[PDB]
Amino acid sequence: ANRMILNETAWFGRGAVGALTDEVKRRGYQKALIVTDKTLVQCGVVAKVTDKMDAAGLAWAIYDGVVPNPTITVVKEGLGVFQNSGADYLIAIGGGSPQDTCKAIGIISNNPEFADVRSLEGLSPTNKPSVPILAIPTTAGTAAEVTIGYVITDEEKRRKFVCVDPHDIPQVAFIDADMMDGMPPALKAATGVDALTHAIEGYITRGAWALTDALHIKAIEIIAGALRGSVAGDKDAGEEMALGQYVAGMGFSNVGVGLVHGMAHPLGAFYNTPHGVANAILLPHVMRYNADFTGEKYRDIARVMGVKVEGMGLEEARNAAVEAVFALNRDVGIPPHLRDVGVRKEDIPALAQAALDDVCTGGNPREATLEDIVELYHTAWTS
């Protein structure tokens, strides 16, 4: 049988954060810890939530120490702030970095034997649900509001480790494109291709089944249709991206992804590369590598990305799906080569070993060898 973990409650649309104060009142919670970063406080994004909490008389504390590719240090600092604050629930405001930090804090607070954070890696054997999390994404996006995964950076061991745990699912998600409109175009582009990567890798993952296939192919259609308009600043395209990135998460959380994520994680660990940029550069090369192992699915992908696939042979339709991703990356201004974003050729053997050992790689429809992964990094390195 196939398991689905989803949000029990979710609010969608511009103004959806307007639902938070009534959700808190209905749940009887006494005090939030907001987990966020300094950029989102400075840009006034956090105030969009705290102004409503203030007007409704709801108590909150804040931890704004989250860094991109959140570290064990940030988790431990946020956990201390949470424990000392007296808060009884968490509000995650931000992209994947604050939402993943928030999941680690909520889990460890109720499962204190995992206080080293490292011990959460893999299928975390936690006995107790997380502290309740209300999740408010500000990128479009990682779908962290609806996934059971989170990824933490171990600075000492220079590795990003994946933690998978039904106990971390947020109780409520608020998916509000008003919270996302302030993303710089380059961040809309990178987080949008992260979402496309989730949906493509989820569509072709070893564990795919009928329900996740339906969610993923819908997400690919929405994202491919909206991302150029959203990067260009179109309001409705931003709202479409907010939904598509979430629909991708409903699928991939429950079945897996593949070698794009497996190869992106070590780049985050080694170089602090933005996750979406790493995914965007790798995606078309890993798609080419996987192509023979994907049945008719690249015909579906090419079709919903706007390619006329009718009358193409399968090999041609597979090429067309790969070309459609290269084209989108060019159109939204993501650099095409890993050398452009600070990767070193010398590190590829170490990166490849880390990718081979990453949780995500096992979902890949083609079984990757160490030398296959080394070769893929080199293919993505330069023209």
Next chain:
Amino acid sequence: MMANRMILNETAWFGRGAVGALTDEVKRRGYQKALIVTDKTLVQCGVVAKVTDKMDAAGLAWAIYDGVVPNPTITVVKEGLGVFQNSGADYLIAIGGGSPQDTCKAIGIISNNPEFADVRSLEGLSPTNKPSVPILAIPTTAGTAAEVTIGYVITDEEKRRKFVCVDPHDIPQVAFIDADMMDGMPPALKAATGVDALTHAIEGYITRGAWALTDALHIKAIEIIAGALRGSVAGDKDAGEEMALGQYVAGMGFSNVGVGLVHGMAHPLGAFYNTPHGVANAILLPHVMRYNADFTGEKYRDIARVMGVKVEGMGLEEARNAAVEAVFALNRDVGIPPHLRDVGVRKEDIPALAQAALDDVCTGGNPREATLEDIVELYHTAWTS
């Protein structure tokens, strides 16, 4: 709010053998004793034993309430609540179709919200302060999607009416969608519960509150159901597993946005005659679709397309007629009677049925604003040739 809410199961298991996941879910949640809410047919047919045998093997305690009747009454809710309170159970397992699942939601809500002990005070947006007793839902029809909806429907025998209780607090904690639990449905019950599911998906697709996510879920559910129902009625194993998924996907949508006049007109037939819900919906659906057609934009082109009609280069009027005809054809193909007279409706009751339908909460979702005279005419149209 401009914003749209979705309530879903936090956890669900899908596929043949999904009930195999129940004992580990119970152990992980630390529950001490189930009350199984079901009916005598499901006990006698061995369906409940598919679950209790696994619970016995895992050493998990249970008691059973098997008093549920189709179109469950205030009496059945009150009796089941007493059995729950007296059993020392700390969670509920709903095994059955909509009747046991709706009874179980009422029991779970009242147990933790005792001020609603009269049951009829739950009608509408139930102002409950406490979540339901945890419910693990195991559908045996395909189906009402009661395992994933926030609605439940109880019969007030005294006032001769079905009333709808809508409450996020009633959502089951886990659903187990296992076509092995559904295979014993008689072909006629597969037909009626299958077209109930189609009605959920079609009404949800065109309901006033429809938006992008529910549209995506509903049109996928219509495709799965229209593709699988004839095969499932014929006894095909894989079609039964497809129906089990399709009926659930319909519920993910309609729970969150609404349905329309088909359900509005079906509830009074249930109240007046104890008409099976799916048969009532099946007979009414094509007539209400025709009534609604001018208020549905391009959506009947989408419905006709996924019901296997060649809609390419059809005008909108032709496509709308084709969607209605596809539903009439499916109803004929799976053996549902075409006329209300055939299933025990009286012409003399149509004025009272129409007022009950006009007042039914479901009717408010209808994309065309129905008048009393429109509903009287729709009952007469569905009555006979």
